Symmetry: D2
Subunit: 321 residues, 4 copies
């Protein structure tokens, strides 16, 4: 039985990380434990069509306190219909953490699962609510194809799982409810190079490109095993990505008629997941170029995401070619 | 704050139920609490696929003990890739309970949510592993359009919820993790007469009838609001049905090439859900006739299920006409 | 496995109780679960001496809400260094409940264990903070040797246990932490007619009567088994009484120099415990006459308590003769 | 909010400890969480006196597994009515841990509280069930006035608390049941130099020395404040020591007629507690010389213990002079 704690230390042991960071990560895990409750105690406290958004808020407060020791933390607001995103800047100045508290702000999409996503970088500038300029700095300091040191997510569903990489493979820890400890439950996780599953919102089938409709239709004809693909679409980003993580296939939020540049956000959502998916033997893309290759120029910048088994994404990139 | 206990008693108070039954239902809720743990402590004990299947088993053992007081209970085996189904027969002989321990036996379908389903009848004949004849009796005593007294389900996901009807509306209780008590969180729940969401495995699109493909395609052209339908398909029966419960739309397991008569089982799965959906202002169907109208002749009898908002099912029944 | 719920119902089943009361008792158990937390979460919330007293208060609030359904409830205040005592009066008017929230108001005495005590009567008159007259009514309506229907305590220590009688023997339920349910763990509990253990504050040895010193000294000479008595004094009323409950012996709060009429209070503390100890095959006394025989004339009326194994109390009554 | 984890790391941060040790201590805390459950789930599993002893056993198994990483561990059996004691020997060979799983083996003494005690030393040569010779080695390698690096106890009662010192003051962490985390709740704890409380089994009054009876009687005459001493004696070692820890006074297990050299064991029980009491501003004695001064020659070696406020122990040492 190896806990998250043990394992963390043993990473610092093999000098993969420093103490100052072992603290940040340890602090984060707690915050996750606390948010899990929130989500289970979901509609008991809210007795005192909206519950998910009031909860986005609280979860950032939780994040804030849990790392007060390591750093100072501020909130890039929800400028449309989104989740507000917390950011911690280490007093030490060595690290910066970007924290999506809960995948979504829809009641529907969180009706069975949700989760927090985070990635950690290594700045240059003393870049220091968060007013415009104040922000942009962040964009320029968070360089996902470069200084991105570690990343992960915690899913809150039937089981609570924390998934994580520091640069040397992905590891997964199930939370033990009895004793309130994370136990390593998945060693160096590897994404099937192939999988016959696809996650898309097909209700948007008619808002897509012909290039893409051909991809999606290609999937439905059988076999040749007489066995078509399987479609599963929870509508929860962390959920759908987790299942893909373990069982392979492809997850996709494409651009369409109404959404010119996708819907998921590069820095908060896409860049962390991809980095993780690459670390596990998969590919993370925008249809044309790997998603980390990309440098965030804009601020709440959107993108198409295609991510999963390594073969399945190539097969897509080809149809969009 | 009204607990499940309080509320139960108050039902017996208004003589809606008898004591002997208030016990059965109370016993069942506990069993659910226990199975929720199992599912959370999912892959910690199993460090000592078939994580799901080994777990189907245990959950029936849990059911058995929890009602030992009220009755005697035996197991209709998994005659294939199914869940084995426990059945309790009251010593009093007044009641019979049919308990699907977990919606599925796939690792992948349970990767974020699962759940138990149950329905309770008032027999005529005494039925007493369960050998063939022994069973069939059951089919003949469980008459879902007649003696079906109460039914419900418990979902195990981000939140644990128990949903239930005794004949006078559907009520939902969230499980409170701190104090380990179910708290009434949804009063007489009503299913939107319409909803623009659809739950189908579209990977089987090419194994379907033209009648049905037309239905499904009808859904994807926009609006006229420019707003198509939404597709969400967890692959978990209880999950998908719960979301439909709250947010409306249609859930569907249709028959196809490979599966001549659907895939869900009439008595264990379909008859309970429908009864609940009717109790909440929706419709439960097989494409042609209401699903409760139907009398189980066969044993592990399958059927197509179409269930949800009242308008959305009519609209389907029409395309299959 | 028989829960408190099951068992309660089965009492109403054998018509030992009515529904309206099954509710009061069921409500009470919850309140206990909640107070247990308070006590465990003891000095975590209180990071945001005197911790015990602030907690007396909260626990009555908890009691209040938990029976809001059954009745209305008010507080007789702490006239010395005591616990304030909640009282519920059923709307139906059939029942009255007296609730000591926590045995003590000392930090020291509650450093490892504490507990709530309650007794329930059937009134003849309407009593309606609680101003003087308002109270006295209560004294006159609560007649412990008469209308006292049920009573019990819940102990909060290494294990949480709820102990209870409705008139036909004493039963004990351990609280199950995993699933948050009370499980019957002691059937019709019987107090050893003898036991070689004594619970007294011997620091007050020199404030006692000679009659009593002789009792206490009688205990310390060995055997004749060469085996003296054992002294155990937690200082926690519920704790010390519980151990006595299971393992026999004598518990004692005597009168002395400074305290002319004992220190424990007849109606709140002594009358409930004794009634329980009589129900389990023991005796509850004041040194001279059984403690229930006694009719409360005064208001916050004190008394010596000697309670435990049936032989050990007789043996005392004799030395005080 | 500082967890045990955070705080541990921050100790290794200020290089007070090494990683290899931060792991041992972290491992131990878990084992404690697990044993706490056992003790709460006390008589629910045991439905499937003698409950305490069967439990001593299990708790060592729990200890074993929880440090399997760090080292190898064996059991010095119960040579009396005692607790068997686990010992871990680090693979490193750098550290050795001695673990009393639960203070006692009596049902009575554990009826409201119990606890595990441990101390950690710094061997030279490795000892490699544990047959005699095999053991003695241990006695010679564990030198409590020398190589004893850290020590602590965990109490299992109304609250679960873990108390600990590594050499720079004593710190106390309450276990948070909701989230299953230890939270620092007592900073550098200091034992009142005086306290008017005494913990002795006075049932053995007549098996004591006159020297000692005079001490004990000295305590019972009042004041001069007119205020005598208070006696509290739970009969639980960890419990009685904990109360003393916080509220001051004296705890005592003296030698007597039947027990020539006390009853508590030097290496397992006494040497750890004292070391802790010294670290908190108190004294730990045998009546004549400080208890750590003493070098264990024998194996399951007994001793009188007098421990607590610094003045109260001196005052005793004098009467025994």
């Amino acid at each position: 039985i190896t806990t998250f704690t043990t394992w963390l230390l043993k990473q610092e042991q093999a000098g993969v990380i420093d103490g100052e960071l072992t603290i940040v990560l340890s602090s984060i895990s707690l915050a996750c434990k606390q948010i899990a409750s929130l989500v289970q105690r979901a509609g008991i406290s809210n007795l005192t069509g909206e519950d998910q958004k009031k909860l986005d808020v609280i979860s950032n407060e939780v994040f804030s306190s849990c790392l007060r020791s390591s750093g100072r933390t501020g909130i890039i607001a929800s400028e449309e219909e989104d989740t507000p995103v917390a950011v911690e800047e280490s007093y030490s100045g060595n690290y910066i953490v970007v924290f999506d508290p809960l995948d979504g702000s829809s009641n529907i999409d969180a009706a069975v699962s949700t989760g927090s996503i985070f990635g950690i970088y290594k700045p240059n500038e003393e870049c220091l609510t968060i007013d415009e300029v104040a922000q942009n700095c962040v964009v320029n300091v968070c360089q996902p194809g470069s200084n991105l040191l570690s990343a992960g997510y915690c899913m809150y569903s039937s089981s609570v799982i924390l998934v994580l990489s520091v640069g040397h493979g992905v590891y997964g820890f199930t939370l033990d409810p009895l004793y309130g400890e994370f136990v390593l439950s998945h060693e160096e996780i590897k994404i099937p190079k192939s999988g016959k599953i696809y996650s898309f919102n097909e209700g948007n089938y008619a808002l897509w490109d012909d290039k893409l409709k051909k991809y999606v239709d290609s999937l439905k004809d059988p076999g040749p095993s007489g066995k078509p693909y399987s479609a599963r679409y929870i509508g929860s980003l962390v959920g759908d990505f987790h299942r893909t993580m373990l069982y392979g296939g492809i997850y996709g939020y494409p651009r369409d008629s109404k959404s010119k540049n996708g819907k998921l956000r590069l820095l908060y959502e896409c860049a962390p997941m991809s980095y993780l998916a690459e670390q596990a033997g998969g590919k993370g893309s925008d249809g044309h170029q790997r998603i980390l290759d990309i440098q965030p120029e804009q601020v709440h910048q959107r993108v198409p995401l295609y991510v999963g088994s390594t073969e399945e994404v190539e097969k897509l990139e080809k149809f969009l070619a």
